[PDB]
Design an enzyme around this catalytic site. Structure first.
Site, PDB file in Angstrom:
ATOM      1  N   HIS A 138       0.835  -1.191   0.000  1.00  0.00           N
ATOM      2  CA  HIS A 138       0.000   0.000   0.000  1.00  0.00           C
ATOM      3  C   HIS A 138       0.872   1.245   0.000  1.00  0.00           C
ATOM      4  O   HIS A 138       2.044   1.207   0.383  1.00  0.00           O
ATOM      5  CB  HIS A 138      -0.931   0.023   1.220  1.00  0.00           C
ATOM      6  CG  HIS A 138      -0.246   0.414   2.494  1.00  0.00           C
ATOM      7  ND1 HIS A 138      -0.093   1.727   2.886  1.00  0.00           N
ATOM      8  CD2 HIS A 138       0.336  -0.335   3.461  1.00  0.00           C
ATOM      9  CE1 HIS A 138       0.549   1.770   4.040  1.00  0.00           C
ATOM     10  NE2 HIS A 138       0.820   0.531   4.411  1.00  0.00           N
ATOM     11  N   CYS A 139       0.282   2.354  -0.444  1.00  0.00           N
ATOM     12  CA  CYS A 139       0.915   3.658  -0.294  1.00  0.00           C
ATOM     13  C   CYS A 139      -0.128   4.713   0.055  1.00  0.00           C
ATOM     14  O   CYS A 139      -0.688   4.693   1.156  1.00  0.00           O
ATOM     15  CB  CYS A 139       1.692   4.047  -1.555  1.00  0.00           C
ATOM     16  SG  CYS A 139       0.735   4.100  -3.075  1.00  0.00           S
ATOM     17  N   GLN A 140      -0.421   5.620  -0.877  1.00  0.00           N
ATOM     18  CA  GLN A 140      -1.375   6.686  -0.591  1.00  0.00           C
ATOM     19  C   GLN A 140      -2.586   6.640  -1.518  1.00  0.00           C
ATOM     20  O   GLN A 140      -2.882   5.597  -2.110  1.00  0.00           O
ATOM     21  CB  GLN A 140      -0.680   8.046  -0.666  1.00  0.00           C
ATOM     22  CG  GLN A 140       0.400   8.220   0.397  1.00  0.00           C
ATOM     23  CD  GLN A 140       0.836   9.661   0.577  1.00  0.00           C
ATOM     24  OE1 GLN A 140       1.866  10.080   0.049  1.00  0.00           O
ATOM     25  NE2 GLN A 140       0.058  10.424   1.335  1.00  0.00           N
ATOM     26  N   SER A 164       2.411   1.798  -5.098  1.00  0.00           N
ATOM     27  CA  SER A 164       2.229   0.382  -4.802  1.00  0.00           C
ATOM     28  C   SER A 164       1.756  -0.394  -6.026  1.00  0.00           C
ATOM     29  O   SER A 164       2.128  -1.560  -6.195  1.00  0.00           O
ATOM     30  CB  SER A 164       1.261   0.211  -3.633  1.00  0.00           C
ATOM     31  OG  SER A 164       0.103   1.001  -3.807  1.00  0.00           O
TER      32      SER A 164
END
Ligand SMILES: CC(C)(C)C(=O)CSc1ncc2c(n1)-c1ccsc1CC2
Length: 150
Positions: free
Chosen positions: A91-93, A99
């Site tokens: 995950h990221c943002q 990701s």
């Protein structure tokens, strides 16, 4: 409240944003034990609970960020979850730009998909993906390295 939407790219590989990664109940129901955090500033969620193995990839969502350097570190982390029957969440943002770049690289590396076929594969399962011309170029450089045996 937010309803977590952990998109299953593969039965053991999940992808989401910052809000999707804070839901502990769904992650245990989906049998994930490995989490990949592709940010510099976000916290490792549920670290004080001693339930997951974490790996942070300190990356920013800029036009100069190098994500190619983090591919092999994430591939082996994804493969270590694959070999023990557990799931992995990367995950990221919000835009899931970082990701999804590694997930496409993983689908390109271990499934032998083309960059478009891999992109169309993830885009069909999570329709909202913010564009990043930097990461697109790094994925294009990654595809030709795969076609020449590197
Ligand atoms: C960084 C990431 C790839 C996740 C992204 O930026 C999504 S946005 C997008 N929109 C249109 C196209 C593409 N990506 C694409 C990707 C690979 S080849 C191609 C040709 C059309």
């Amino acid at each position: 409240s937010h309803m977590a939407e952990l998109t299953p790219i593969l039965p053991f590989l999940f992808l989401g944003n910052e809000q999707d990664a804070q839901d502990l109940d769904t992650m245990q129901r989906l049998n994930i034990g490995y989490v990949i955090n592709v940010t510099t500033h976000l916290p490792l969620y549920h670290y004080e609970k001693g339930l997951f193995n974490y790996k942070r990839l300190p990356a920013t969502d800029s036009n100069k960020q190098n994500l190619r350097q983090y591919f092999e570190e994430a591939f082996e982390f994804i493969e270590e979850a694959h070999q023990c029957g557990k799931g992995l969440l990367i995950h990221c943002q919000a835009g899931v730009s970082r990701s999804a770049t590694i997930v496409i690289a993983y689908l390109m590396k271990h499934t032998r998909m083309t960059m478009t076929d891999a992109y169309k594969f993830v885009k069909g399962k999570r329709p909202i993906i913010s564009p990043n011309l930097n990461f697109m170029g790094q994925l294009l450089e990654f595809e030709e390295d795969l076609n020449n045996g590197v």
